[PDB]
Design a protein around this ligand. Structure first.
Ligand SMILES: *[C@](C)(O)C(=O)N(c1ccc(C(C)(C)C)cc1)[C@@H](C(=O)NC(C)(C)C)c1cccnc1
Ligand SMILES: *[C@](C)(O)C(=O)N(c1ccc(C(C)(C)C)cc1)[C@@H](C(=O)NC(C)(C)C)c1cccnc1
Lengths: 301, 301
């Protein structure tokens, strides 16, 4: 029993974190095989951050201008290229600790673990989700750039996020491992506003199923609803629309508990219209939306 | 910016997790140097759990009855002993991945990271705290016994908890690495009730300081209080008493923000008497007490 924000064991990723310096700027890089991946803004200077021309800035950089350090060991750079907003530094040594890996561009609503790093050294690990507005609500400080997001399935690490920046809102924006930003964000010190952040409906429902499995059952009611009637309530409270694919993804949870998805939707509707009345569900006084149905079946069974 | 329940990077501990089988029972063990540490209830059978006599059960066990497996590798047991509620299995090979470590018996209120394991394989990592009633609010399933709690300070891992059991409440009880249970709990399937779980006052205040550093300042008020006047409110809401040592431990946080500890105590008093009025602090609608002042300075600066 119990339910916690649980991250993947971070060991496979710790062995891949390196320090990348280019001039005055130091951030984190990801070392897999003979390539170090890092945010391209490592080549920027104080009077270059408002509107950098990365192609022009990179012209003035050679392999020897990129200092890569894995622990107390210096790596030799034998090649360099820019791919979207990420730099790929070819080094002459393959990382002996490289796990089996793949690069994945996650969909909004999906979750992942973050290993926050500073100067190439891992500091801590936590869970987060790609928000529907393509930001992440992380915990990052100055120097955390290059810190990665990942999932682990049967010893295979799927990298999905690289941290690039913080918006004036205090939320975080970044890319997949091919350098493509999630959302409309750009790597420059400019006015960037996030959109409306909606609640991940399918995740809240998965968390209500986790609460039932754990003995929290007060919220369960004598009512039911339809997909269209629930979605009228969902739109009102800025909840993302629920489709038949979401119902299908919740199948294992509905079958294990014997509670139909639309009956759980009716309980959710009552919670949205009435609130929690000072009560709690799984130790929380808010509806939690950062646990997918996968995260629930992994931690509850 | 941001604030998350952040665990230590688990890599140093993953390399120490092994599987221990004794008869029909399989659980997790901790492999450090040439010793494997595990819960002694691994020697119990189905018709032995209500009132086991461990000394008598262990008489019928020899070194060869303890099967220790680190990954796909079998370890040879050359000695065995019981120390309080923990078994120490001397093996003939030192763990090559043994980090610098120490065993620590933590005080209630202190926090730690848990690497939940099943069959010697790490499944996930999360943060928890030793509750004032000596339980932990973890996330553990059948087979999780032997999973450990730890802190990491400058490459030195301080082990503080080994998971032994779940109470009928759904909360968890366990020992330090010397086998002494935290609290009055016993390793047998019996009626064990936890005491009153009070709120860790010094931790809530540290979390209010973290919220101020992050821009959440609505709760700050025009009032102040005394240690004795605050403690009258603390006792009423089942908050542990605040002492001058707690005030002193909050020193770095009060000095970094310029907000006196007693002024933050007055804000806490107003929050206890009025509630949050539907509002949130650092994404939570409840007062969070599982972040110590150390956890706040580490993650906020
Ligand atoms: C990275 C470099 O470690 C970092 O700390 N931040 C950062 C600095 C500068 C950039 C430029 C060169 C402007 C593209 C991007 C990222 C830092 C910021 O995001 N700072 C600004 C852009 C000034 C808000 C950062 C702070 C907190 C959390 N993540 C990143
Ligand atoms: C351990 C062995 O992995 C385990 O799953 N639990 C456990 C079983 C049996 C014991 C005895 C032999 C009775 C001392 C202790 C622990 C399991 C329980 O705590 N189960 C009971 C005691 C029947 C409630 C456990 C379940 C969930 C979380 N942690 C432990």
């Amino acid at each position: 029993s119990g339910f916690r924000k649980m991250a993947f064991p971070s060991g496979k990723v710790e062995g891949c974190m390196v320090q990348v310096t280019c001039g005055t700027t130091t951030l984190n890089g990801l070392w897999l095989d003979d390539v170090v991946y890092c945010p391209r803004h490592v080549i920027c200077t104080s009077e270059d951050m408002l509107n950098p021309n990365y192609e022009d800035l990179l012209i003035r950089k050679s392999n020897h201008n990129f200092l890569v350090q894995a622990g107390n060991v210096q790596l030799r750079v034998i090649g360099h290229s820019m791919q979207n907003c990420v730099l790929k530094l070819k080094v002459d040594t393959a990382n002996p600790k490289t796990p089996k890996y793949k690069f994945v561009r996650i969909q909004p609503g999906q979750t992942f673990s973050v290993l926050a790093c500073y100067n190439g050294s891992p500091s801590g690990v936590y869970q987060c989700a790609m928000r529907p507005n393509f930001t992440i609500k992380g915990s990052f400080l100055n120097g955390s750039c290059g810190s990665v997001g990942f999932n682990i399935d049967y010893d295979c690490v799927s990298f999905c996020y690289m941290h690039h920046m913080e918006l004036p809102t205090g939320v975080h924006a970044g890319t997949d491992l091919e350098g493509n930003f999630y959302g409309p964000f750009v790597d420059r010190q400019t006015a960037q506003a996030a959109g409306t952040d909606t609640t991940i409906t399918v995740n809240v429902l998965a968390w209500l199923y986790a609460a039932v499995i754990n003995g929290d059952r007060w919220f369960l009611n004598r009512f039911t609803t339809t997909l269209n009637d629930f979605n009228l309530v969902a739109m009102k409270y800025n909840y993302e629309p629920l489709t038949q694919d979401h119902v299908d993804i919740l199948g294992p949870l509905s079958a294990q508990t014997g509670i139909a998805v639309l009956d759980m939707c009716a309980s959710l509707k009552e919670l949205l219209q009435n609130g929690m009345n000072g009560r709690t569900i799984l130790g929380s006084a808010l509806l939690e939306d950062e646990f997918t149905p996968f995260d629930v079946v992994r931690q509850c069974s």
